[PDB]
Design a protein around this ligand. Sequence first.
Ligand code: FES
Ligand code: FES
Lengths: 163, 163
Amino acid sequence: MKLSGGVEWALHCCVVLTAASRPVPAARLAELADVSPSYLAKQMQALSRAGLVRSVQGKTGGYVLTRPAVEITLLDVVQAVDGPDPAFVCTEIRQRGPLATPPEKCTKACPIARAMGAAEAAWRASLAATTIADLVATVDDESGPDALPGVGAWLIEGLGHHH
Amino acid sequence: MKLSGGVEWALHCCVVLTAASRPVPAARLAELADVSPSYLAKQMQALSRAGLVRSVQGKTGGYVLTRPAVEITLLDVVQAVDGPDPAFVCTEIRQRGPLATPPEKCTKACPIARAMGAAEAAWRASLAATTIADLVATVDDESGPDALPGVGAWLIEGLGHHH
Ligand code: FES
Ligand code: FES
């Protein structure tokens, strides 16, 4: 099992909310992603349960990040969607068979499990060391300084006005 | 996100093969772990296809490592069993919806995909930097010098004697 499809979506969602820098209603995010408002709202639940997004009420209400983009790491978003479980799971096969390691000697993790855990720690360190602010800065530098502001304006234009 | 159960088994198999002075039949490895020969054989065929173990014929035939333990990395074993696919797959969601990035502006990978790719590279680099010889050295240090030789002796004892 690799990462679920929700990780790609949730990372893009955090970048687009930073671009808006004002509450974005479910309907406007849903239009941007070409899905229904009710489907978008269901996907947002992973980010709201993790305390990364909240809902603002009122006529120009909608979703906002709960803290600045520099305080949201890629690891925060990945764990919001796919949870905290490591990729490698030790099933304690060293406790099997006629030369089984007795449980009283199985307090410390298997050296194999520890090496796999150290590799996972490098993956998590890389995700923890990168922020939503870094992604926004790279999009700015490569798409131009007008690209994300354009997305932000499109999301919030006309909110609280009836045409 | 999960690595298949075969990774744990294949890493243990590589470690115990270092302790054997002769080819080890799949049947003896299976007996040591009190596990189905057919399950063990599938993990050993994955290691064989990756060029990490080979089958020796004759009366005391069985599996041997194809090269020294110091030349076999955790990455070699993980990819032999779970394949080369990364954790994160970009589905080009930036090409969706009314503000879709046109193909001509999709010459570079998405910055989000590149950040996830950098984390994957950190994971692979950690697995590539640890060898079966490192695992053996750690087992010798923590289980004592007699642990692996005990397993090695058990695996090869009596082969070709018919008691
Ligand atoms: S007993 Fe699970 S990795 Fe060794
Ligand atoms: S389009 Fe796939 S990670 Fe951005």
